[PDB]
Every structure is written in structure tokens, then in C-alpha cells.
Design a protein around this ligand. Sequence first.
Ligand code: FR7
Ligand code: ZN
Length: 349
Amino acid sequence: TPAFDKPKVELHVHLDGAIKPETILYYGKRRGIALPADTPEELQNIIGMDKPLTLPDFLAKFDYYMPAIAGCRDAIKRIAYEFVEMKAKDGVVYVEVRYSPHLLANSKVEPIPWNQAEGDLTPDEVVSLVNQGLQEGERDFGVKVRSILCCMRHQPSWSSEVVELCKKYREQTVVAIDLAGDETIEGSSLFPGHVQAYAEAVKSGVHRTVHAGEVGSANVVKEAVDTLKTERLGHGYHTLEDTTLYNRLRQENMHFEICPWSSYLTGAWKPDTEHAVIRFKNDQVNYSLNTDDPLIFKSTLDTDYQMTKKDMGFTEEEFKRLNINAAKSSFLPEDEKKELLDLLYKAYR
Ligand SMILES: C[C@H](O)[C@@H](CCc1cccc(Cl)c1Cl)n1cnc(C(N)=O)c1
Ligand SMILES: [Zn+2]
């Protein structure tokens, strides 16, 4: 089957949408919460998607399965570990894994995510546990792993704990801040909780990505560049609808975090249209191919490669380019990014 069985890099993927059904059923039963089914399989199909789906019909998914894990130290670390193992199985050599620490917390967070009753697991201890699991992960399956903490659109009261958390735990394993959630909250990029968070990220060399352009307009991408100052964008499709902004980001060699399967699934991309990635490819963009959420999208990395191979003419050589780029566009430190590149230059020949 495999579409490029060469090593890859991956920059854009959510931990909380990368759990095994059966680890969820496990803490489900283990921790008396009821999941809406009782085989890992009924579950998949259920948190699984095979059509677009409304912002809420899509967020409710986080309630089928997140109260199994959040709260639970052992669970959190377990998911971090088995994410890594998951990525070894796709043939990846470097992954940047992203999440919100508040969304696995049950203490020292307002408001309490997912109906949790208040407990003791805080947003700081989530980071440690995620680290513990990601590092031990790395050691066992030999994948390189960094993490990325997400800010939430709708909750810029979190944002500075986020940067702070990012600086606290830097390369041990965190590399950057993100912006995620409902990109269609109006004004949201400029919410001063977020601006100051990114600004602070700039004060103290923390790398930046932001979700934009997947659903919200080209305006949201340019607030991402100009005001939050990102180095990378997650998605950035709608970038096309402003020629000058596309132009200048092509010229700046901005990184595009592309999630092709994800976008058909979500609705973001519709199929009587030109898929945005093909454009990128035609235009020699800096972009990577990424999976977003293996859980929700019923996917693996090779899913993504299949569609562009099989649907969009992607040749192996683009594959190569795109991985080289993503490596190039890692939030790794300089010295260790060169070493990623040596690894891929050699594997690609
Ligand atoms: C970013 C974090 O790493 C979680 C957050 C999921 C979530 C939960 C509550 C409220 C909102 Cl709006 C969202 Cl998107 N995450 C997981 N998958 C996505 C996605 N594709 O948007 C976001
Ligand atoms: Zn994402």
C-alpha cells in the first residue's frame, strides 16, 4: 500500500485528537465515565468522521472522549507515549505534537474543561506528564519529538499561562506557542490576551505557529503575520483569496502547515474546487503534509499521502521536497535542524 515509504517529518497534529479508541475505553471503564459505545471500533466509527459537520456537531466529539483522559495523570502520560509509538509507525523521524494543557486539566483552570468536576491535575502538571511520556516515547520507538502548546481562541485568559508554560519547559520538550480553536470568533486574533501572549513569545524567543485560513478569511491570516507575528501558519488555505498576501508570503518563504485529508473531512475544503495544496505545489510553496487528527479523521499519515499521490498527481519528488521543507521549517534549534536535514538528504538518495 504505502504512498511515500520514506521517512517523514510532520509539523501539525493534535495529541487530543490522536488517541487510540482503546486507550479511551480503558480509562472510560477504568475511571467510571461513559463513552457512547463499548468496543474500540464502535468508538472509532462514532468519533469518526466521514463528512463535514458543524462547528458544534464537531466539538461534541471532544465530549465523547476527553473526560476519559483529562483529570487522569496516568492517562495523559499514556496518550503521550502512544502518540509517539503511533508516529514511529508512520515512518516519521520528527514530529511536532500540539495541544492545550488546560483542556487536559482539572484544577487551577477556569472554566473547568468538559464538565469535569474540579480535581488536582493542573495545567502545569499536564505539561510535565506530556513531556515525561513524549521523552520516554522518543527513547523507545526512536522518533524525535517536540511539543507545542496551544492557546485557545475563545479563552485568552489562558494565553499568558501558555507562554509561560512554553518558556518554563523549553526543548525539554516544548518548542512553540499556537493558536487554536474557533477561528471565526470575531476579533479573536487581536484579543489582547492573545496579542500579548505572542508578543511575549517574541520577547523571549519562543517560536510561533497559528491556526488561520482553514475556515476564517484571508484577514485572519494577515492578522496572524502582522500582528501575532507567526513563523508558520496552520492551514492558511484562505490565503489565496488575497493575491498580495499570497504573494508576499511566497516571497517570504512562509511555512504552510497543510492538512489535506482533514480539510476534505472538515468542510474547509470542497471538492469541486482546486484543492489548495495543488496550488501550493504548482507555486513552489513552503509546505508540509500533516494529519491533524488521526482519531477524528480515521486516518494515518499515509492517508494524507495517498490523497495527494492518488488524487492530485503528487510525485515522490514533491514528497521529498515537502519533507525537506518541513524540516527546514521546524522549530528545532539550528544545530539540530541541520542534523534533521542530513538525515533526510541521506535517506532521500
Ligand atoms: C488545540 C487542542 O490541541 C484541541 C482543542 C479542541 C477544542 C476543544 C474545545 C474548544 C474548541 Cl473550539 C476546540 Cl477546537 N484540538 C484538537 N483537534 C483540534 C482541531 N482540529 O481543531 C483542536
Ligand atoms: Zn490543527
